[PDB]
Each structure stands twice: as C-alpha cells, then as structure tokens.
RNA sequence: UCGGAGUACAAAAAACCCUCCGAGUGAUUUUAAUCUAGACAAACCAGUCAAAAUAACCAUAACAUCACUUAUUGAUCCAAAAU
C-alpha cells in the first residue's frame with residue numbers, strides 16, 4: 168500500500184484508477200481502416216539469406232470498406248498486381264520478422280488507398296525512363312499516320 | 319549399466335599405488351640439460367636476446383612505434399560512463415517460461431530473470447539493466463507481465479498481441495545492484511534505500527507512453543498501445559476482462575525497489591520479521 | 607608493458623593503445639588513418655577520402671595490441687545507441 | 702495482352718523480371734588488412750541484429 | 756614571389772571554409788565553389804589569411 | 808533446477824520436447840542435460856577445426 | 863629526403879663516397895563534390911587507380927591544364943584557431 172511524493176497518482180492527478188491505462192477507446196478511432204479479419208494473409212518462410220515473404224490478398228470488387236470511386240481507381244492504377252480471380256495482392260520481403268512484413272504490406276495498402284482517395288493526385292511522370300517511351304511512341308505514330316480504311 | 323564395472327571385479331584393488339593421470343593431461347616440462355636443451359639453451363647467441371635484455375613490447379627498434387604513429391581518436395572515449403543494457407530476446411524468455419524457470423503467473427521483473435539465471439547483471443560494469451529484443455517475436459506465445467529497462471517497438475507489440483503488459487522502468491546503479499542480488503543485500507543490515515530517478519538524458523525516454531515508460535502518463539497508454547496494434551495488424555485484447563488482470567496491472571512506485579516492500583524498511587531474516595520506522599522525519603525522507 | 611604491477615601484482619594496460627584503437631569483440635582492431643587531419647589544402651579529394659576512413663589492422667598488429675591490453679578491454683559490451691554494435695560478431699567466415 | 706491469357710488461353714498470366722547476377726566478392730579474410738569498416742557489411746547475410754544465445 | 760594560404764568563406768550563409776593558395780601581390784580572391792550544405796555552386800569570398 | 812511443467816501440447820513454443828515415457832530398446836542411452844536439453848555441442852580448435860560432441 | 867636516365871639489353875625487384883640530369887615549385891582558370899564494387903603497391907606507416915549510385919551544372923553536363931610532370935615534401939604528440 169506504499170505511496171510516494173513521486174507516485175503515479177500525484178504526478179498525474181487527473182487519471183488515477185489502476186484500470187485507467189487499460190481502457191479501450193474504440194470510440195477514439197472509429198475509422199478502422201483495413202479490418203484485418205477481412206484479408207487473406209499468407210506466410211511463405213524462406214530460410215537459408217533468411218527472409219519471410221508475407222502476402223496480403225483480398226477481392227477488390229467485394230471490398231466494402233473502401234468507397235466506390237476509390238475502389239474503381241485502384242483497379243486502374245494497380246491493375247498490374249491484380250489477379251484474374253479479381254484479387255489484389257500485396258507482398259513484402261525485407262525483414263526476417265513477419266510482423267515487420269505485415270506492417271509493410273498494411274502501410275502499402277494505406278498509401279494506395281490514400282493516393283487513390285485523393286482527387287488531387289496529378290500522377291506526375293518523370294522524363295528519365297519515359298523519354299524512350301514518348302519518342303518511340305511519336306515515331307510509331309509517324310508510320311501509323313497512313314490513312315485508308317481497311318477490313 | 320556401465321559394463322566397465324564388470325571388468326573391475328577381475329582386476330586388483332584400486333589403491334593409491336596404481337593411479338594414472340589421463341594420457342596427454344600433463345605435457346612434461348623440459349629443462350636446459352644435456353646436449354639438446356643445453357649449450358645456449360634456446361636463447362640464441364650473444365646480442366640483446368641471449369642476455370635477456372630485449373626492449374619493451376611496443377618498441378620497434380627506434381622507428382616511431384606503430385601504436386604511437388596512429389592518431390588519437392575518441393573510440394573508447396568516456397566508455398566507463400556509457401549505459402549498458404544486457405539484451406534478452408523473446409526467444410530466451412519463451413524458452414525460460416516453457417521450462418518453468420520464470421513463471422508467467424506472477425509479475426516478471428529483473429530479480430525473477432536473475433533467479434532463473436536467464437540473465438546476468440553486473441552493475442559494476444555499468445549495466446543499467448535488461449533490454450528486450452525482438453529475436454523471437456513471431457514464435458512468442460506466452461502471456462506475461464514484464465518489466466525491463468528498455469524495449470523495442472517490435473518486442474512490445476509481440477508481447478501485447480498475446481495479452482500481456484510491458485513496462486520500462488529505471489534503476490540507478492545502487493538500486494540495480496540491490497535488485498539483482500537481494501539476499502546478499504538483506505544480510506547487509508541496512509534499510510531499503512529509495513530508488514533514484516533517471517538523469518536528465520533518460521527522462522524523455524521514460525516519460526513517453528511510446529516506450530511504456532514507468533514515469534509516463536497513463537492517459538496516453540491505451541492510445542499508443544492501440545497505435546501499435548494498428549501498425550502490426552492484430553486485434554488488441556481487453557486486458558481488463560482477464561482473470562489474471564489484478565496481477566497484470568501491478569506496478570511499482572517510482573521510488574520503490576521491490577514488490578510489496580517499501581523504502582526504509584529493514585528485513586530481519588533470522589526472525590523472519592520486517593522492521594519499519596515510526597519516526598516522522600524518517601518517514602518523510604523515505605516516502606519523498 | 608608491466609607484466610606484474612607493484613601494488614596489485616596484476617598486469618597493467620597501456621593506455622596509449624586504448625586512446626587510438628577500438629577492439630571489436632571478434633578480435634578485429636580498428637584505427638584511424640595517419641595524418642588525416644594534417645595539411646588538407648594540399649591534398650586530393652580522393653586522397654582526403656582515403657584518409658577519412660576507419661581501417662582494420664593486420665594480424666601481427668592485432669596480437670601486439672592484444673598483448674598491450676588487459677582482459678577488460680576484450681569483454682562483450684552492450685552499449686545503448688552504439689554505432690559499432692552492428693560489427694562485433696563475424697558472419698559467413700569460412701576458414 | 703492480359704485479356705488474352707485469361708480470356709482465350711484460359712491461363713494465369715506469367716510475368717518476368719530482369720535479374721542481374723549477384724556482385725562478386727573475394728573470399729572473406731580473417732584479418733582484412735587496411736580495409737574500410739564497411740568491409741564487414743559485404744559478407745553480411747541480412748541487415749538485422751541476431752543475438753545468438755541472448 | 757611568395758604565395759599565400761587564404762581561408763575562403765561561402766556567401767550562402769552556410770559556414771563553410773576551404774583554403775587556397777593565392778598569389779601574394781594579387782587582388783583579394785573571389786570564386787564560384789561548391790557548397791555541400793546548400794548543395795549548390797555558390798560564390799565564395801576570402802574571409803581570412805591563414806598561412807604565408 | 809525446477810522439473811519442467813507439463814503441457815497439453817508438444818513440442819512447446821520454444822521447440823522443447825520432453826523424453827518419452829518408456830525408453831527405447833537401443834543398446835545405448837543419452838541422458839538429458841541438467842537443463843533438460845539434448846547434449847550435442849559444437850567445438851572449435853585452432854580457429855579452423857569444427858567438431859560436434861555428443862556427451 | 864624526393865624524382866628521371868644508365869648500371870638493371872626482353873615481367874617485377876636490385877647495390878656502390880657508381881655514371882648523369884633534376885625537386886623543396888611556379889603560372890593559369892576549366893575552382894576540380896559525395897559515396898562506394900573491385901584492384902595496384904606494400905614489412906609497417908604511408909602511397910596509388912577506379913565502375914555503378916547520388917547531387918551540381920548543357921537540363922541523360924565529374925580526369926583541373928602547362929612547365930621532360932615524374933618530384934615540388936613531413937608521423938604522433940602538442941600548440942594556436944572555433945566549425
């Protein structure tokens with residue numbers, strides 16, 4: 168039953184009861200982005216370099232926690248990593264601890280949803296690797312320019 | 319069992335007369351006698367070496383010595399004052415619980431870790447305590463109330479996920495010494511000293527709920543604690559509704575060394591009694 | 607080096623070593639390059655870099671420095687925030 | 702092209718990378734002499750501390 | 756003729772210095788150098804005289 | 808040193824598995840260590856000689 | 863003490879109170895960054911090159927140049943500077 172001048176109650180008068188710290192403020196964050204129960208989370212453990220592939224799969228069209236405009240823009244930007252069964256698939260590699268991997272996946276997802284839910288995204292493209300693309304495009308467009316109907 | 323025994327019937331008594339050191343145990347020493355080991359006796363010929371006088375160790379023969387031509391640079395600079403936290407992986411903690419060295423039932427602090435010999439602290443070497451590292455995070459299934467002096471985010475998360483509680487507490491050198499080896503302290507015949515505070519450098523560490531600091535504001539605790547669960551993607555259990563919860567919330571006073579004892583008491587171990595000061599000044603001092 | 611001290615009868619350390627080198631736990635010693643603070647305006651950028659390095663000592667020097675240094679300096683240290691903790695163990699060394 | 706594999710050939714769609722060979726490092730030496738500290742990182746397996754018995 | 760070692764300072768407001776050998780009988784030196792902090796090619800003017 | 812606690816499931820999280828109820832029929836036996844582990848150790852000599860001891 | 867040629871005829875190294883030339887810096891503006899695979903050389907200390915990658919600038923812009931270019935140099939400590 169010991170107490171000191173420096174004890175936890177007299178330092179912070181406002182909160183006292185021993186159950187104060189363990190309260191759960193589910194009202195504080197009601198957003199609950201990424202309801203992890205709704206994701207398929209796979210662990211491929213590669214030991215030898217030691218790294219654990221962690222994978223996050225979910226159906227994009229069937230995912231209701233994301234708005235419709237966002238759910239449609241995602242299927243545009245990320246269609247490369249979408250699967251023929253309609254599954255969006257994220258993958259992380261780096262750490263040997265799959266906590267860190269899962270965290271990387273979830274952060275990736277958060278960021279994708281973030282940039283897709285922003286209408287202000289201008290999708291700015293660099294001219295470094297795309298110079299070849301623009302020039303070879305233009306130059307296949309010089310040939311494509313022949314006009315007579317066919318078929 | 320040992321078929322060797324059956325041979326021992328056949329042979330004469332083992333006595334002092336017949337005893338052989340294990341072969342190879344004693345490499346016989348050799349003396350400078352005789353043709354081989356005599357006549358200059360391994361010392362060479364004239365010079366400084368046969369006479370025994372060759373110079374000291376670092377000396378290169380007068381050219382500026384190697385160990386002195388290299389410039390001084392703080393490497394070991396102020397090393398004696400750096401803080402040292404003996405690491406404890408979740409792997410070892412789990413292995414310790416599994417074999418029932420430490421029991422997860424009662425709260426786990428430094429003294430419990432020492433008593434299981436899961437860890438060893440030597441305050442004289444400026445060990446400030448145990449730090450928790452994440453080595454076994456993925457495999458860690460036990461549910462614990464643990465108190466260490468430093469911890470990593472991943473370690474903490476790994477303990478929360480299983481519904482336990484981590485807290486980072488500070489001990490000063492004297493405190494720490496007493497905490498690791500209590501029974502030799504109680505034979506000392508001294509009161510139980512106050513636990514000192516952290517110095518100015520370590521205060522911002524122990525005041526943050528980020529670190530589950532023992533000096534932190536418990537208002538922030540559930541918030542940060544939930545933030546962890548967002549980041550590592552697991553459902554945060556309600557510790558409140560558990561049956562062992564009374565043990566899980568257990569703290570120490572920031573000024574208190576042990577669980578259930580108090581600064582200024584005296585443990586008489588021959589009578590199995592505690593002695594407490596009734597004086598006003600003493601009680602003011604120890605309780606401040 | 608003093609092999610047997612007078613008061614304690616123990617073996618002393620040569621501090622002049624402790625000031626300029628750093629012993630990893632593997633047994634590797636680490637040192638600064640010589641003349642790295644000296645006359646910088648007169649030197650190439652490349653050379654300047656070659657000087658700014660931290661480098662390893664060859665075996666002979668390592669044994670020498672070990673002999674000049676007591677056991678305390680070879681203990682396994684865990685420092686908080688330590689830059690060099692990363693480097694104390696050796697990995698994948700096939701010998 | 703994505704449409705082809707799924708719709709016509711009734712396949713999953715194979716995707717490839719361009720993989721360059723891992724960089725060549727000399728045999729590691731017990732006492733690397735006059736080598737920068739970062740030497741020890743070239744033979745490093747993965748960047749993560751590992752506390753062996755600890 | 757002797758030359759001189761002068762300390763030269765950035766006008767970028769970043770404290771940054773580099774020393775240069777410059778002719779003794781010549782004018783106060785001014786150059787365009789590289790400042791690492793601002794990561795730019797900026798103007799350096801001689802602040803001080805270090806060595807002779 | 809405490810005898811290990813009985814569990815409901817083997818092997819344990821740390822991978823520790825107790826010895827069997829009977830002992831095998833082999834004409835040799837390997838005791839557990841005082842810490843209840845299997846006594847197989849590795850040893851080096853001269854820095855290059857790697858050995859494995861069964862005790 | 864440092865460099866070039868011979869001695870030392872063709873990979874390297876190679877001595878003499880051996881034979882001969884030099885160096886202890888000028889002049890100039892193109893003011894010549896950071897980081898790092900791999901190597902040369904080597905008793906040690908010191909020396910040398912250098913891809914990729916960053917950042918600087920044409921907006922995919924990193925070898926200061928000339929004088930036989932090679933040599934124009936000096937460790938720790940300690941002092942002055944304050945970055």
Ligand SMILES: [Mg+2]
Nearest residue numbers: 347348349350
């Ligand atoms: Mg003898």
Ligand SMILES: [Mg+2]
Nearest residue numbers: 353354356357
């Ligand atoms: Mg003899």
Ligand SMILES: [Mg+2]
Nearest residue numbers: 352353356357
């Ligand atoms: Mg004789």
Ligand SMILES: [Mg+2]
Nearest residue numbers: 358363364368
């Ligand atoms: Mg004689």
Ligand SMILES: [Mg+2]
Nearest residue numbers: 363364365366
């Ligand atoms: Mg002689």
Ligand SMILES: [Mg+2]
Nearest residue numbers: 404438439440
């Ligand atoms: Mg220790």
Ligand SMILES: [Mg+2]
Nearest residue numbers: 849850851852
């Ligand atoms: Mg051994």
Ligand SMILES: [Mg+2]
Nearest residue numbers: 901902903904
């Ligand atoms: Mg060679």
Ligand SMILES: [Mg+2]
Nearest residue numbers: 913914915924
């Ligand atoms: Mg380049």
